[PDB]
């Protein structure tokens, strides 16, 4: 296994923040999450797709990373980059953001 997250990072209100994650096995789809809500999906065969709850302020970042624009005090919390791989299974990583 391999779990290499960006770490517990912080940014100011109004600005933007980049969420990085790095994984040995074929990556089928990477799911981004704001605590329990789904932020985005990066499917290997179908590409990047943003949730209707975040199309207005979330754009695909570099590689399999994400960019959360127009920050607010409510965006503080856990963030998860789920890696659904084959045959290794699912690998998850945690990232805490403060604002």
């Amino acid at each position, epitope marked *: 296994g391999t779990i290499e997250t960006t770490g517990n990072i912080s940014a100011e209100k109004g600005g933007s923040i980049i969420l990085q994650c790095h994984l040995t096995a074929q990556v089928t789809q990477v799911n981004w999450e704001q605590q329990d809500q789904l932020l985005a999906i990066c499917n290997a065969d179908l590409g990047w*797709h943003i949730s*209707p709850s975040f199309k207005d302020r979330v754009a695909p970042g570099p590689g399999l990373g994400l960019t959360l624009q127009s920050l607010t005090v409510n965006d503080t919390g856990e963030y998860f980059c789920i890696y659904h791989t084959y045959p290794d299974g699912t690998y998850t990583g945690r990232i805490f953001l403060e604002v």
Partner: antibody
Amino acid sequence: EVQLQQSGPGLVKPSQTLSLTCAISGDSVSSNSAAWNWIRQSPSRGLEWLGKTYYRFKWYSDYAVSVKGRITINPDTSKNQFSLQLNSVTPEDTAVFYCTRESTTYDLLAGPFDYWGQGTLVTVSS
Amino acid sequence: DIVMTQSPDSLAVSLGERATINCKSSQTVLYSSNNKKYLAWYQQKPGQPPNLLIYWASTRESGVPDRFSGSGSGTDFTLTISSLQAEDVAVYYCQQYYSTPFTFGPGTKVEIKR
């Protein structure tokens, strides 16, 4: 084509819970190209989205702010159906409740409601 | 939330004549990355659920006749019926599927002048 059959009682006493089911035929509940939504309609509020359940590589749920804390939409993979549970029902919840399929083929997280159930008239009265 | 509005509350048109109904979103439903308008049109006949007519602002759904068509873009949308038939009498709604919550317009009742 996809067929959606609705079931569950229409009459609900105030404060008690409304529970309806939407049985699917012609598609799966865990489909990556679909989301399973509940919409309501009344002459006072028109058409209003209530919530949805979708499985991409994990089960997810998104609900309207006007019902968060009362609403629950859970799938059943073995029975190929999705439920609606509205707790603490008030006379304002009286509406025709429709279950519908959101066709998310091009954009996997967004699409129009291409198929709808017959509708269930829900009356809130003692 | 995106508020959807429809300019004609009701419209009465003679049999075989054109009927155009307008729709407007408070924000643009055009997503740049794929150049798609997240807007749909529905027809609801009395006592039955709404039927999808158009999606992506201009794409006709399978099985819906050629007389129904969608145009307009970004924020202002227009559903047209080139020749209104007797069976086309219904309330027609527009909806945005761009941001949560997905919202519908107030509806436009299309009726026949005879």
